[PDB]
Each structure stands twice: as C-alpha cells, then as structure tokens.
C-alpha cells in the first residue's frame, strides 16, 4: 500500500464522514420540474490505528445512483488513507428532495410599473433549518426604482446587478415566506418584449437531497487490540444549491 503508511497508532480512534451534495433544478413557473440532478461526494476524515479494513454502507426510503467513481483504495470496502480523502463521487436524478419551491407572480401595470410577488415554500422536516438563503429576482433593464417589503429577511435592489436580492438567515421546514416588489419602469422600444430571466436561489440544508443516509461504516483491525465498537463515528450532511432556477 502506497497511500497509507504503517505503524499509525491513534489513542482516540475517530471517524468523520461528510456527505456533500449540490441539488440542481430548473422549474417552470407553474411548478413542473424541467430538469434536476444531485451531484454528491463523500469525504472521510479518518483517525484509525494501523491498517484498518472498512465497509461503507448506505441505502443503494432508498436511492438510485446513476454513476459512481471511487477512490483507488476501494475494491463497498477499502483500507482508507490517514486523514482527509474523498471516498466517492456520485450523481442521482430520481426521487430528489427539492428543498424549496419558488412560486413567482408578475402583474404588468400599463407600460409603467411591475407588481411582483415571490413565495418560498420550504419542503423538509420542520425540525431542520435551512441556512444562507438568497433569492434573486431579475428586474428589467429600464427600471428607475424598485420598492419592496419583506417580512422574513432583508432585501436590497442591487441595480448594478440588475436584480432584487432577498437574503434570509434561517428557515424551518414546512413553512413559507414571501416578498413583494413594485418595479417602476422607464419607457422603451415596445418592439422588444423583455426576456424574463428565472428566479435563482441559494440555500444550505442539513440533509442530502438525494435522500442519502449512511447505514454503517464498520472498521476491522485484526492485528491491533481494538474492534468496531471502539471507534467514535460522526456524520454530517450538507446540501448546497447549485443551479436552482424557477422559470419566469
């Protein structure tokens, strides 16, 4: 073995497993999913003594995995390198948890103003907090000012970025928050109707949206005087948003 030295001895044999996913979604304005996938990786922080042989186990509520690529140490069993390393990458498409639903509403008002209401519905256990929430609502190019009021969170109209940005610190599962805007328009060539960009989101949810759960990670060292019951094991789930757009 050239990835793990011999004679590693740890006093406290601990085990840290980060499962990291980016859920991606393109959704029509009416609620229809137009594309979605999860890209995941499982990184393992190992502090185990000797040259241990591990079996990593999960629900292959189960999951489809459409593709895998493993660390060279795999054969799911492997002798892990010391310290931090990436055990596998994966991608799933079926039965993804879509942690937010974005619900856009746009009312034209003459050729002068744009009345806009956007609703976030959060769709996961209410015992869990989504974090770092941002909702980007694109404003047309010919906007003189925009007025917004928001209940949860704070919202500023970055006019340079040409988009209202709505930021929200926490939000629990099975809830809903909303934001309302009035967009004052300049006059413009009525030749070109406006190419309405989608609404973008970013969030961090404490769960794998692929529904991945770790069943077992078992450690077996035969030579050294410890066993699986001796290893302190820990697992965190972290779902970021990649491209999370609701059309119109």
């Amino acid at each position: 073995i050239g990835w793990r030295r011999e004679g590693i001895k740890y006093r406290r044999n601990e085990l840290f497993l980060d499962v990291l996913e980016s859920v991606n979604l393109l959704m029509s304005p009416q609620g229809q999913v137009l594309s979605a996938h999860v890209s995941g990786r499982v990184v393992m922080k190992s502090y185990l003594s000797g040259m241990p042989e591990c079996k990593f186990g999960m629900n292959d509520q189960s999951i489809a995995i459409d593709d895998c690529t493993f660390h060279q140490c795999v054969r799911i069993s492997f002798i892990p390198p010391d310290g931090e390393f990436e055990l596998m990458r994966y991608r799933t498409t079926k039965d993804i948890i879509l942690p937010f639903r974005v619900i856009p509403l746009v009312r034209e008002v003459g050729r002068t103003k744009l009345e806009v209401k956007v609703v976030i519905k959060s769709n996961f256990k209410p015992s869990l907090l989504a974090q770092k929430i941002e909702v980007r609502i694109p404003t047309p190019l010919n906007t003189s000012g925009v007025q917004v009021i928001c209940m949860k969170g704070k919202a500023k109209y970055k006019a340079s970025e040409n988009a209202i940005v709505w930021k929200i610190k926490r939000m629990a599962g099975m809830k809903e928050s909303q934001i309302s805007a009035e967009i004052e328009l300049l006059p413009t060539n009525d030749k070109k109707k406006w190419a309405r960009p989608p609404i973008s989101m970013n969030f961090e949810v404490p769960f794998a949206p692929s529904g991945l759960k770790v069943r077992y990670l078992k450690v077996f060292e035969p030579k050294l005087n410890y066993s699986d019951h001796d290893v302190i094991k820990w697992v965190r789930y972290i779902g970021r948003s990649g491209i999370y757009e609701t059309r119109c």
Partner: peptide
C-alpha cells in the same frame, strides 16, 4: 455540526 453515527446493522 457532526452528529453521532448509530449502527444500523
């Protein structure tokens, strides 16, 4: 953060 891992086996 990290939460404990109870054996499901």
């Amino acid at each position: 953060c990290y939460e404990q891992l109870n054996d499901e086996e």
